[PDB]
Symmetry: D2
């Protein structure tokens, strides 16, 4: 029985990932920043699939200590085979007068935290000796800028580069590392005509790919950023 940990799975993409992985037979670890009740609800529904589901408080704003909750969560579940580094909320702030503390705060939660969590998970995966899967939830803005969100863009890009480096260095341990880059996700047909598919995506349309990356059939996929965006990246000033 394998174990999947999904950060920030009290809601949104994280919750959909945790629920689908439970459906697929993984014991589940759920982390929460502020909303323990949402984490409890996800745990309950995850456990309804006949699976163990454990929750822990994780606040990646005070580092490195804040990341130790991943170590406690792994110890409660006995092992870890999957880590989904799920992205927190997006923040807008003009580049020209952004305070350095805000710049650092955004990097702390959006890439520093993922780095520390991945280290902890990858260490256990190496010792277990049975490989593993690490999925970094990034964004289209790993590849293309979000207006008025320069720190968010830069940190998503950083996490994209970290994904590549982790995949290269951990492949010898059969740990495959990929990013899933969502476009606009609603958290109805024709609601966003700026996007070629003309609607936002569902959390399921992201979780379904995350689940595939955890499946036996993904055993040759590593180092990639898989963009799930309804054609967002194809729309240029011409479209």
């Amino acid at each position: 029985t394998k174990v999947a940990i999904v950060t920030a799975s009290d809601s949104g993409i994280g919750k959909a990932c945790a629920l689908l992985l439970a459906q697929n037979g993984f014991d589940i670890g759920i982390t929460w920043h502020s909303d323990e009740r949402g984490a409890q609800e996800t745990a309950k529904k995850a456990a309804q699939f006949g699976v163990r589901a454990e929750t822990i408080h994780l606040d990646l704003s005070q580092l490195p200590e804040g990341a130790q909750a991943i170590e406690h969560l792994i110890q409660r579940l006995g092992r870890v085979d999957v880590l989904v580094n799920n992205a927190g909320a997006m923040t807008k702030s003009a580049f020209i007068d952004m305070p350095f503390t805000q710049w650092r705060q955004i990097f702390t939660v959006d890439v520093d935290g993922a780095f520390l969590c991945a280290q902890i998970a990858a260490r256990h995966m190496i010792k277990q000796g049975e490989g593993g899967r690490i999925i970094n939830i990034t964004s289209v803005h790993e590849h293309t800028p979000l207006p008025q969100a320069s720190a968010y863009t830069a940190a998503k890009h950083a996490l994209g580069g970290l994904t590549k480096s982790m995949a290269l260095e951990l492949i010898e341990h059969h740990i495959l590392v990929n990013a899933v880059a969502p476009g606009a996700i609603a958290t109805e047909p024709g609601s966003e005509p700026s996007i070629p598919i003309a609607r936002p995506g569902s959390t399921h349309e992201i979780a379904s790919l995350v689940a595939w990356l955890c499946s036996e059939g993904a055993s040759y996929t590593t180092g990639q950023s898989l963009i799930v965006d309804g054609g967002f990246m194809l729309a240029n000033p011409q479209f």
Copy 2:
């Protein structure tokens, strides 16, 4: 049975095409199989496909003389009665030094590696639009849609071409609920430690491509379109510093 969807996979007599055809049959698609010269392999794929309780039909496809050779796709569609999935599967790679390559060889490689996929895609998309129920088109390209293969400039350029067409089709067919993506294999075997130049140190299996192609045909992929999804055991990660 009125709800049964049809997948057509070109060159599914063997290799990656065969793996896609059989997995899609196992997942519940009636299957169209095309073959260039290995008819018995095509008959063996149809045999196994039908053990999953679906229809399987085969047809000879000779993409060497275009546009006429692509009509076999229209005949296969007619036999199956509809098409919901097309997998434009990649023929064999060809090598030739750039400085000396005959024009005939340049044109021959483009003929099989992007002109055919263009024509097959048109035919399938016309049926998908008329059917009015959407569809999925997967173009099997290669890591060389993105990075060059030495001594294979024609092949690289044609894979790049097919990547561009993928993006164009995705944009132009989205209004008909047709999602269009490329799957870009690294080196796939036709084992651990057998390919030291690749980070994962081995070639891929055909199942390791087919599995993603199957996911792209599933309900969960309804928001994925216009992308090149690379399955290469880390091939794209390996640069000059991968040494030592």
Copy 3:
């Protein structure tokens, strides 16, 4: 030793701007024209006022491979070739679902098949001369992102992008550097005229030619296999723009 640059379709637009700026840089110039010979001669007359030799030749890349032989004759006239600029011809739109196969092939013929044959001819001479060379393929932002209703154009630009990387890898041993210049929207004969582009205007032909000329310069000797995008921010604008 006076170096030679050949620029296809330099009777007008970007090709003319590259030919004239390379002329000012001290290259002898080869100029090809499809139908406007007087425009080509006008380019040659202006290039020659910079004190270099300029030569014109008809080039029709629609009938291949014979059509590309004009490049060989231009080189024989000029005595050598050091720079080839494969310039981009006109863009044509055609719906993907309806596009006839002959139109598909026609567009690939002029937009990548012709560049391939010209590049071969120039590279053969650069190899034999033994003094390296530079080949610049003018592509487009649509080497990288689709142009709606122009699937053939987009596919061919992508193809020329791949050829560029392939040529650069195989010709590096002869010190031949191969790159693409990928323009966005370029005006041919002002601020705020194109609000959908972050710069809010189309580019000038000079703003493309300037980089082509840098790519032919001594300082560019470590740059090969790349697609340099000159687009006023075009690639940055997504539905969030």
Copy 4:
């Protein structure tokens, strides 16, 4: 009117080459150094032979944000800033699995945090001046492809490439153009010495500085938001590259 170029870490290597070439192109030059005040002063003396002003200042990008004030004092001495070249410090290697957090942070501090604070200051002056400007971020091929045993370096270079795109979009209305120049292997004081690279040698610092100088020139007025890779074909070599 005399324009001003500020190049960080121009006491040596790529930064020094950029400073000297911009001095030849007529920019008054601002030079920063981390420890080698002497390389900096030799850079200034040679820049001054081109008839321009050269000012040197210590820049401690390791302890921020206060260290970035050194850029304000430089702009004060030179009177304005028209070009900023964000030039990278030294590369540090460390395995991802056990890389200390302090080292992850130090690498980000010098590879993107300093560039971010310096670009902010430079941009505020370019807006105040009202005559546009050019900001060049020196990244790396590693902005695009990983460097083994250098995950923090790779991540931080990716971050600086993303910041580059965001700044280009956000500053375009002020006619401030922002690009990255992404060098491959660059030599510091020969053909065939790097066979893993298709060109089979490292690059010269002048082969980077030349593109940086073009990006500051009149003809580069339509180029923004891009990452211009100068790498001798590094990006073309994959597992199938040989010999």
